């Protein structure tokens, strides 16, 4: 299904290596030509060795082979469609009718399911089957669970967006602290849960939790080979500032938070800026405060030519 052989040849010939330089020691010149022709399957072990002989990254080879796009299988297409249905809420119905029934078919489809449920709440679309069956679904998915995979964190990240924090709380706790890295994808979803949960805590002034998520994130920087996402690290760090402000009413912290929000504008992160402004506004309100003239200036400017923004979506 993946023209891996094609890639081996391409890389081999570009690098000027001869077939002998690859199959010698590994396999027969006849069978290798069968591999490089995309007629005979290749084991990850074989590919692993060819990768070492070529001097090109294993994963890069896979990517070049066509696995560099999560559109290789069913679920892939469905996730890409979420973005589409999010800006074209008219395509919701017919599509949601097809996903809803398969929501428990695999963690993949459930993540996709929650994906639609998000679009619905956003566009104030009625999804009665949700409120009626989610607690059941979760019970079914997370009951005899001991370890969690990347999609697990993905699911909980989206869950935090369509379910009151209190219901999601108990499901999260057994998923941290994290002890190892298992890929960029895994490292990314494990940070999203933390980042969304830290946001919810702060918005609820639930500082005991916010503190917890901050420590959990901080801990991730300790783990070897874990790719800490820049943006998140910046946005989480901003939440850290507002956290210190709610704690010791320290003004420096508030300034730093505002200053961070500024940087997002300076570097071009339009949505993140819009997002954190509307956020610092609300949190300041609940605190009997009035943010600086600019922060408060952007707000009305956004909430008018925006009113109801689309949440961030990573893929």
């Amino acid at each position: 299904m993946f023209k891996i052989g094609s890639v081996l040849k391409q890389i081999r010939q570009e690098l000027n290596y001869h077939q002998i330089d690859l199959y010698s020691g590994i396999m027969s010149k006849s069978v290798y030509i069968k591999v490089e022709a995309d007629s005979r399957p290749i084991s990850v072990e074989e590919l692993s060795k060819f990768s070492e002989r070529l001097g090109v990254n294993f994963f890069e080879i896979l990517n070049r082979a066509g696995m560099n796009t999560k559109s290789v299988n069913e679920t892939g297409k469905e996730k890409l469609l979420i973005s589409k249905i999010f800006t074209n809420p008219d395509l919701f119905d017919k599509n949601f009718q097809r996903i809803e029934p398969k929501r428990l078919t695999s963690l993949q489809y459930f993540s996709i399911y929650l994906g639609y449920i998000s679009i619905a709440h956003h566009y104030n679309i009625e999804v009665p089957t949700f409120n009626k069956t989610i607690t059941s679904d979760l019970k079914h998915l997370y009951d005899k669970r001991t370890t969690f995979f990347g999609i697990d964190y993905e699911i909980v990240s989206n869950l935090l967006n369509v379910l009151p924090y209190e219901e999601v709380s108990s499901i999260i706790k057994p998923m941290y602290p994290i002890v190892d890295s298992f890929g960029k994808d895994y490292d990314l979803t494990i940070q999203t849960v933390l980042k969304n949960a830290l946001t919810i805590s702060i918005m609820n002034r639930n500082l005991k939790e916010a503190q917890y998520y901050i420590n959990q994130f901080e801990h991730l920087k300790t783990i070897k080979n874990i790719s800490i996402n820049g943006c998140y690290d910046l946005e989480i760090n901003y939440l850290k500032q507002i956290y210190q402000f709610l704690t010791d009413k320290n003004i420096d912290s508030y300034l730093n938070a505002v200053n961070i929000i500024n940087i997002f504008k300076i570097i071009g992160k339009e949505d993140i800026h819009r997002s954190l402004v509307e956020e610092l506004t609300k949190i300041s309100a609940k605190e009997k405060f009035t943010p600086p003239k600019e922060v408060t200036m952007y707000y009305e400017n956004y909430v008018a030519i925006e009113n109801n923004p689309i949440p961030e979506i990573k893929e």
Binding site: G115, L160, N196, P311
Partner: peptide
Amino acid sequence: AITLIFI
């Protein structure tokens, strides 16, 4: 805010 992740 709440980032929707679909990797």
